[PDB]
Enzyme design. Structure first.
Site, short mmCIF file in Angstrom:
data_model
loop_
_atom_site.label_atom_id
_atom_site.label_comp_id
_atom_site.label_asym_id
_atom_site.label_seq_id
_atom_site.Cartn_x
_atom_site.Cartn_y
_atom_site.Cartn_z
N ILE A 83 -75.86 3.72 47.71
CA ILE A 83 -75.78 3.93 49.12
C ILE A 83 -74.41 4.59 49.47
CG2 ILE A 83 -75.15 1.50 49.53
CD1 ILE A 83 -76.75 1.76 52.24
N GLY A 84 -74.43 5.57 50.36
CA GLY A 84 -73.23 6.15 50.95
C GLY A 84 -73.22 5.72 52.38
N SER A 112 -75.51 13.55 61.14
CA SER A 112 -75.03 12.29 60.56
C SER A 112 -73.60 12.26 59.99
CB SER A 112 -75.99 11.84 59.43
OG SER A 112 -76.04 12.83 58.41
N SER A 145 -72.61 10.04 56.87
CA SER A 145 -73.17 10.59 55.62
C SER A 145 -72.07 11.20 54.73
CB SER A 145 -74.32 11.57 55.91
OG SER A 145 -73.88 12.62 56.72
N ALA A 173 -79.11 18.01 51.96
CA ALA A 173 -78.73 18.06 53.36
C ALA A 173 -78.42 19.45 53.85
CB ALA A 173 -77.52 17.16 53.67
N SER A 174 -78.70 19.61 55.15
CA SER A 174 -78.55 20.87 55.86
C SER A 174 -77.66 20.59 57.07
CB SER A 174 -79.93 21.42 56.31
OG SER A 174 -79.80 22.65 57.04
N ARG A 227 -81.95 5.69 70.80
CA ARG A 227 -83.02 4.77 70.34
C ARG A 227 -82.87 3.37 70.81
NH1 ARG A 227 -86.16 6.15 65.09
NH2 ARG A 227 -84.42 5.04 64.05
N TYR A 230 -87.84 21.25 64.46
CA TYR A 230 -87.45 19.88 64.60
C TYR A 230 -88.18 19.32 65.80
CZ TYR A 230 -84.12 16.04 64.70
OH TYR A 230 -83.51 14.82 64.81
C1 LIG Z 1 -78.70 10.29 63.36
C2 LIG Z 1 -78.98 11.08 62.13
C3 LIG Z 1 -78.68 12.43 62.03
C4 LIG Z 1 -78.97 13.14 60.84
N1 LIG Z 1 -78.71 14.44 60.71
C5 LIG Z 1 -78.94 15.12 59.58
C6 LIG Z 1 -78.65 16.55 59.47
O1 LIG Z 1 -78.17 17.24 60.43
N2 LIG Z 1 -78.93 17.11 58.33
C7 LIG Z 1 -79.44 16.48 57.25
O2 LIG Z 1 -79.71 17.06 56.20
N3 LIG Z 1 -79.78 15.22 57.30
C8 LIG Z 1 -79.53 14.50 58.42
N4 LIG Z 1 -79.84 13.16 58.47
C9 LIG Z 1 -80.39 12.53 57.28
C10 LIG Z 1 -79.26 11.93 56.43
O3 LIG Z 1 -78.07 11.88 57.18
C11 LIG Z 1 -78.98 12.85 55.16
O4 LIG Z 1 -80.17 12.86 54.35
C12 LIG Z 1 -77.76 12.54 54.33
O5 LIG Z 1 -77.66 13.55 53.32
C13 LIG Z 1 -77.74 11.15 53.71
O6 LIG Z 1 -76.39 10.82 53.32
P1 LIG Z 1 -75.84 9.36 53.16
O7 LIG Z 1 -74.50 9.46 52.50
O8 LIG Z 1 -76.06 8.66 54.44
O9 LIG Z 1 -76.96 8.88 52.12
P2 LIG Z 1 -77.75 7.50 52.09
O10 LIG Z 1 -78.67 7.42 53.30
O11 LIG Z 1 -76.80 6.38 51.82
O12 LIG Z 1 -78.62 7.74 50.77
C14 LIG Z 1 -79.62 8.75 50.75
C15 LIG Z 1 -80.22 8.81 49.35
O13 LIG Z 1 -79.31 9.28 48.33
C16 LIG Z 1 -78.98 8.27 47.38
N5 LIG Z 1 -77.51 8.36 47.21
C17 LIG Z 1 -76.54 8.17 48.13
N6 LIG Z 1 -75.33 8.37 47.58
C18 LIG Z 1 -75.54 8.76 46.34
C19 LIG Z 1 -74.67 9.11 45.28
N7 LIG Z 1 -73.33 9.13 45.49
N8 LIG Z 1 -75.27 9.43 44.12
C20 LIG Z 1 -76.62 9.41 43.91
N9 LIG Z 1 -77.51 9.04 44.85
C21 LIG Z 1 -76.98 8.70 46.06
C22 LIG Z 1 -79.51 7.00 47.98
O14 LIG Z 1 -79.94 6.07 46.98
C23 LIG Z 1 -80.64 7.47 48.85
O15 LIG Z 1 -81.89 7.72 48.16
C24 LIG Z 1 -79.57 12.44 59.69
C25 LIG Z 1 -79.80 11.10 59.80
C26 LIG Z 1 -79.56 10.40 60.97
C27 LIG Z 1 -79.92 8.95 60.95
C1 LIG Z 2 -84.11 8.45 66.18
C2 LIG Z 2 -83.81 9.60 67.06
C3 LIG Z 2 -84.30 9.93 68.26
C4 LIG Z 2 -85.21 9.35 69.18
C5 LIG Z 2 -84.73 8.32 69.95
C6 LIG Z 2 -85.53 7.76 70.92
C7 LIG Z 2 -86.78 8.29 71.13
C8 LIG Z 2 -87.21 9.37 70.38
C9 LIG Z 2 -86.44 9.92 69.40
F1 LIG Z 2 -86.91 10.95 68.68
C10 LIG Z 2 -82.84 10.65 66.73
O1 LIG Z 2 -82.92 11.77 67.24
N1 LIG Z 2 -81.85 10.29 65.85
C11 LIG Z 2 -80.89 11.33 65.53
C12 LIG Z 2 -81.28 12.15 64.33
C13 LIG Z 2 -82.17 11.76 63.32
C14 LIG Z 2 -82.48 12.62 62.26
C15 LIG Z 2 -81.91 13.89 62.29
N2 LIG Z 2 -82.00 15.01 61.44
C16 LIG Z 2 -81.26 16.03 61.95
O2 LIG Z 2 -81.19 17.13 61.43
N3 LIG Z 2 -80.64 15.58 63.10
C17 LIG Z 2 -81.07 14.26 63.31
C18 LIG Z 2 -80.74 13.42 64.35
#
Ligand SMILES: Cc1cc2nc3c(=O)[nH]c(=O)nc-3n(C[C@H](O)[C@H](O)[C@H](O)COP(=O)(O)OP(=O)(O)OC[C@H]3O[C@@H](n4cnc5c(N)ncnc54)[C@H](O)[C@@H]3O)c2cc1C
Ligand SMILES: C/C(=C\c1ccccc1F)C(=O)NCc1ccc2[nH]c(=O)[nH]c2c1
Ligand SMILES: Cc1cc2nc3c(=O)[nH]c(=O)nc-3n(C[C@H](O)[C@H](O)[C@H](O)COP(=O)(O)OP(=O)(O)OC[C@H]3O[C@@H](n4cnc5c(N)ncnc54)[C@H](O)[C@@H]3O)c2cc1C
Ligand SMILES: C/C(=C\c1ccccc1F)C(=O)NCc1ccc2[nH]c(=O)[nH]c2c1
Lengths: 542, 561
Positions: free
Chosen positions: A141-142, A210, A214, A224-225, A399, A462
């Site tokens: 987890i990160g 994130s 993240s 990730a993008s 949310r 999206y």
């Molecule tokens: C509010 C919100 C906004 C978001 N926006 C974006 C966005 O703009 N773009 C995007 O691409 N994604 C987005 N996401 C999705 C998420 O942030 C990404 O997928 C991100 O790359 C996950 O990183 P983390 O460090 O949180 O990983 P975690 O959620 O902790 O882990 C993700 C996965 O990778 C594994 N992992 C984590 N660290 C490592 C490591 N060091 N080595 C090997 N495996 C590992 C974990 O076991 C898990 O399967 C968003 C999520 C949320 C909730």
């Molecule tokens: C959960 C949520 C929104 C929500 C809240 C209440 C009702 C309906 C909803 F869709 C939301 O957007 N979270 C931020 C988020 C999540 C995943 C993302 N991926 C991106 O690229 N950016 C991301 C950002």
């Protein structure tokens, strides 16, 4: 932006983000975000309550089972660990809707047995060796920001589950200013990474929504993008080097040459591996001098279709700004509702972020308005664009708000060829309406899209889906099923399984069809070589 | 652009390129290229002979059966029923038993290959390739795919102890453009289409890929994908990994293909990258979708001289730093600058020395960058001004579009110069690496010195030609391209000497922070460094994929692993 070991000190145990940041009704009865973290923090949003009320029709622990020789041995390493309930529960989940329910109003089937905090590559090596010696399962987890069930512990995993937390392996190791690369530990957060580089006049420009939580490692695991990929690239464009600890041993290339032909690129075997193969411990990432100047913008179009055609044209000319997003009418109303002609029911809006040298920015901007003009596009103001982007980091907080008022929602995404975008948006948005009415949702759901990234061959779309679950006996079921139907519709309309969220355990059932049976077998063959006994047992992907 | 089945009709059985195109001495004693294929064909080069003589110490005037076809009769019968064309003829088998490494051309010119294909097949579509792979499983046949036959890594050499019947599976008749998607700017094509034919057909509809490797006359889409090919204009169009959106691959296990054409995905490890760089060890790439672009409206060539090579490298680095590299920028060292000078048309005095000639026309230090811009005329010309302003800051002086233009045309002619040099006791080859920006100058200096030391130590009489240029810029470094040649008279095993010097230069590259390869790949030439390069686990991962996809080693060229 260093995440403490006891995350709950600083972060909500039962939702997104910082404890000090939550929507509330201020002393004038208007919604406002608490605290001082965000540019919108402490800023009255006078018309937000109204938008919500209009849209949604509302008024407003298992024990830790652990071998003692393992514990004894772990003690000699001096790696910090915890068997505490609140530490294990905090890492049992990401940010899918169902997760946030089991976290709030219930309990998970399976949580990690023990949390470890390695601070470096060598600590990770020790842990993987202990895991081989004692037959333990590792879920890395990160940030804990997965939206793919990628952190969920499998219910029938009977081995001791280590939550391998990377948050304390978080240093910049070197910045190479001759080559514009920075070598970092993979637990560094986006926010911290950019804060530190900025002090030297550099950035990565990788800005997922994130980023506060993240991590580099997370980005590489999930492909990730970022919001400014048009300038900086996505993660596969940014990573020059990585070091990975598998049960088989350490994967690392012997040189930092920018591009190679030495067989299939093994970096792409690890990118997208979703914690199933090993721990990404270190990576080298491209950096850039911090842009001089940033400007926001917006453009109104008569309808969504014209907007799409304009983004396409912009993509065809290869003159996309740093970010360009096109919002359908609903998201535009939503934006308008968060401030401090044409047919207005279908009017769409693009938001623009330009960044670079000021004189090139100004010139770029003119070019983009001139293109937009040919599709009926009208400059709609900088402050508008700017507000759209300053919203980016607060939507996540909405949310928790919604949940207080029986509103449930989630976003989902796809990528699609340009010639499918318009049909896919309409068809998916319509499918959501249909499923909801057929399952007994009393008010038509919010069902909205935006085009969020452009490419030569297509776009990331999206979606947001949300509804008032008044008078529904099983709201989560209804939600799960409608989201699966949406997905089915996306795949029917030529969209991909995922643009950036990944597969985790949420989209597993469609992977084989997406990548072919021999493709799946290739992924399996690597998994079985690198990790024959499945130490990395989150069960994502396969 | 179509490669005919009996290639030796059109192409040289014993060297590079078209039969109608060789360097000869004209009636004035000047080197000239025969034929009418290139812009330099039939153009006298009056100082070229002098440069050769001064560089390699030769006079130039003084010049320089097969294994039977082992094939199962029931397979032959089943193959007859598919109507896939084939040949057991020795000239057809020999032609496809090699690419264009020096040792291979030697064994052609004065010897024989230890092992050659037993039979050549010409599938005309994806379903034909599926039937062939089905038959190789059934009869236990080994398949080595060939497209252009332009490998420079021993990637087509048949392993001497392979006892199965080897099929040369020639893709040259699978060369159609299947669709052009003008909405998404993608073209779906069969894998045996050559670069020249691909660009010609696409330009008829107003489009191009802009993927232009120096082998484009013969190298194919399937070739490019297998070897991670890099093109001259990748700064605009990308390298092959940026250009491919989709592929279809026939493996013994079944067909690999993703189910959608989305531009970018996150659905686990990108299996396209398991295939890209697979060097014919996994299966046959039959079709691919490749990004296309509107044909550029305008091209502008240019050239810039710097006081030395180091200042040139600093300039390229800054151009990379501001991310304003043109379609192509190439920085040649002083020896290549002299070479370029010696292929111009003005006839010099026989009494004024060349070095003095050149000087009158520091000239032993100066380096020259050649440049190509293409796109919208307006943007091209703004862009060129931008690059020339950066170059001014590093001592750069505009050096004429004429030289840029000549530099770009020479790229497709240089390959014909091997054939020439081999007539006069001169052997050589080019090789390449990629390296971080801060290693480039030291690497170049050190590799050139190693090659000098090694030739001397191995008995080479004249100092070798040993020259370099920077052919690509990236954010994190550059592609460096070397040429190595020497007169081999008085050497008892000249191939051994070349071979061992080549390997030592490579050891020097790796020791200077260079890569094993930027674009030529590993084949069977660089296998011994591969583990060290990608790690033992990384090697084991490639092996796991090979073992799954091709468990019986039907795709048995033995490259990489
Ligand atoms: C509010 C919100 C906004 C978001 N926006 C974006 C966005 O703009 N773009 C995007 O691409 N994604 C987005 N996401 C999705 C998420 O942030 C990404 O997928 C991100 O790359 C996950 O990183 P983390 O460090 O949180 O990983 P975690 O959620 O902790 O882990 C993700 C996965 O990778 C594994 N992992 C984590 N660290 C490592 C490591 N060091 N080595 C090997 N495996 C590992 C974990 O076991 C898990 O399967 C968003 C999520 C949320 C909730
Ligand atoms: C959960 C949520 C929104 C929500 C809240 C209440 C009702 C309906 C909803 F869709 C939301 O957007 N979270 C931020 C988020 C999540 C995943 C993302 N991926 C991106 O690229 N950016 C991301 C950002
Ligand atoms: C004069 C000259 C100039 C060159 N310039 C460049 C350059 O600018 N850039 C560059 O990157 N390289 C260059 N090369 C090297 C070479 O042309 C490339 O590696 C090219 O990609 C090979 O393509 P091909 O069609 O000739 O493949 P071949 O040489 O026919 O085959 C190469 C390898 O790929 C396999 N293969 C071929 N087709 C398929 C298929 N359909 N499916 C599966 N496997 C297949 C073969 O089995 C072999 O292992 C040059 C070579 C020469 C001789
Ligand atoms: C072999 C040779 C030149 C030569 C001839 C005689 C003596 C010594 C030599 F080095 C040469 O460059 N051939 C053209 C060639 C070959 C491989 C290339 N790869 C590229 O990227 N571009 C390529 C171009």
């Amino acid at each position: 932006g260093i995440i403490p070991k006891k995350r709950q000190e600083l972060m909500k145990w039962n939702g997104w983000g910082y404890n000090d940041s939550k929507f509330f009704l201020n002393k004038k009865g208007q919604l406002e975000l608490t605290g001082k973290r965000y540019p919108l923090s402490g800023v009255a949003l006078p018309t937000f309550k109204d938008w919500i009320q209009n849209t949604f029709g509302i008024n407003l622990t298992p024990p830790s089972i652990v071998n003692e020789d393992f514990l004894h041995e772990l003690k000699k390493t001096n790696i910090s660990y915890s068997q505490e309930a609140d530490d294990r529960v905090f890492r049992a989940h990401g940010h899918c809707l169902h997760e946030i329910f089991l976290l709030r109003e219930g309990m998970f089937e399976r949580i990690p047995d023990i949390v470890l905090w390695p601070t470096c590559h060598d600590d990770v090596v020790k842990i993987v060796n202990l895991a081989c010696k004692y037959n333990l399962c590792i879920i890395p987890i990160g940030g804990g920001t997965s939206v793919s069930y990628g952190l969920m512990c499998p219910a029938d995993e009977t081995r001791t589950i280590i939550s391998l937390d990377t948050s304390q392996m978080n240093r910049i190791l070197w910045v190479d200013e001759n080559n514009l690369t920075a070598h970092v530990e993979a637990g560094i957060t986006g926010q911290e990474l950019e804060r530190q580089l900025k002090e030297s006049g550099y950035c990565t420009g990788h800005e997922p929504d994130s980023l506060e939580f993240s991590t580099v490692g997370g980005w590489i695991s999930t492909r990730a993008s970022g919001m400014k990929k048009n300038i900086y690239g996505n993660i596969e464009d940014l990573v020059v080097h990585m070091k990975v600890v598998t049960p088989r041993g350490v994967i690392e290339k012997s040189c930092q040459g920018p591009r190679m032909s030495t067989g299939p690129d093994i970096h792409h075997f690890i990118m997208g591996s979703e914690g199933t193969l090993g721990v990404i411990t270190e990576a080298t990432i491209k950096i850039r001098p911090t842009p001089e100047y940033q400007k926001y913008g917006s453009v109104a179009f008569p309808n969504f279709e014209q907007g799409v055609a304009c983004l396409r044209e912009i993509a065809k000319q290869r003159c996309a700004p740093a970010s360009i997003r096109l919002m359908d009418n609903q998201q535009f109303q939503f934006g308008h509702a968060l401030k401090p002609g044409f047919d207005p029911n279908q009017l769409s809006v693009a938001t623009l972020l330009f960044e670079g040298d000021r004189e090139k920015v100004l010139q770029h901007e003119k070019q983009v308005y001139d293109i937009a003009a040919k599709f009926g596009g009208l400059a709609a103001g900088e402050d508008n664009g700017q507000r759209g982007y300053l919203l980016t980091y607060v939507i996540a907080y909405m949310r928790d708000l919604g949940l207080e008022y029986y509103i449930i929602g989630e976003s989902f995404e796809t990528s699609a060829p340009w010639d499918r975008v318009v049909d896919l948006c309409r068809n998916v948005k319509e499918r959501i309406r249909r499923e909801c009415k057929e399952k007994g949702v009393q008010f038509p759901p919010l069902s909205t899209c935006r085009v969020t990234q452009t490419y030569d061959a297509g776009a990331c779309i999206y979606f947001y889906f949300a509804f008032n679950y008044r008078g529904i006996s099983d709201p989560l079921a209804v939600f799960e099923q409608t989201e699966a139907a949406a997905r089915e519709e996306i795949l029917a309309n030529g969209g991909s399984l995922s643009h950036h969220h990944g597969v985790g355990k949420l989209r597993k059932q469609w992977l084989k069809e997406s990548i072919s049976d021999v493709g799946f077998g290739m992924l399996k063959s690597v998994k079985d070589y690198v990790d024959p006994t499945n130490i990395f047992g989150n069960r994502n992907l396969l």
